[model samples]
Target chain A: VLYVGSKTKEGVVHGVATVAEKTKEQVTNVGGAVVTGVTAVAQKTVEGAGSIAAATGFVK
Target chain B: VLYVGSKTKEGVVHGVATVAEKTKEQVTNVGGAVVTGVTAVAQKTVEGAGSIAAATGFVK
Candidate 1:
């Protein structure tokens, strides 16, 4: 799975570490200097009822 | 597996959605206040052969 990626000026892995450590989320550090820190967040997405209802119309 | 994470003030997720939606990537949002949207990018890294060669220097 691919996790969200971000970084700070100091290159430290921030926020993301917590999510990864706490939940089923994963994280990655794509770019940034080694000295700076980075703040990354991860979240899951779910289709809303509207989309489900729209798709239901086409169900056959 | 840990997924990349990111967030915006409004709490909307963008970009990474395509990869996760179309491909097999996953995403999450960890920080930022509500009301704004966030965009996150995820990519894998490959270890360069140079490191292997450097380590092979000690080969006997």
Candidate 2:
């Protein structure tokens, strides 16, 4: 999901892009808490930038 | 990306998949989810994923 529309701020958009890229790579072999926690902060980061509200977790 | 051709869990890959989806929306109206519970390690994973930087910054 490297896609973010023009309406979004570039800063946070890019941040989640990095997160998405890293997430894609890191989550390839394994999937569980790292994914959860990583996404937790990730999703929250976007929320911080104004995405969706969220909670905790991660996977590997 | 809304484009998880494969490697997708369909059940919320509930981690980055969900995060990425939600990232698409709100950042992309993007995506939403259900509760899958959290683990101890999962929480730590999120905390360590540079979340400490933002979470602490955001928390206060």
- The lDDT of each candidate is 0.23, 0.26
What TM-score against the true chain A does chain A of each candidate get? 0.17, 0.14
Clashes of 1: 31
TM-score of 2: 0.15
lDDT of candidate 2 over A1-60, digit per residue (tens):
554343322112122212243222222222111223333322333223332223223322
Judging by lDDT against the true structure, name the best candidate. Answer: 2
Query: Which portions of model 2 miss their true places by more than 4 Å?
Result: A1-45, A49-60, B9-50, B53-60
> What DockQ values do the models have?
0.05, 0.04
For candidate 1, lDDT tens digit of each residue in B1-60? 266354322322223311122222233323212111222322222331111110111112
In candidate 1, position A57 carries an lDDT of: 15
Q: How does residue B24 of candidate 2 score in lDDT?
A: 22
Which ranges in model 1 have alpha carbons more than 4 Å from their true place? A7-45, A51-60, B5-7, B10-60
Per-residue lDDT of A1-60 in model 1, one digit per residue for the tens? 355455312212224321122223233323211111222332223322111110101112
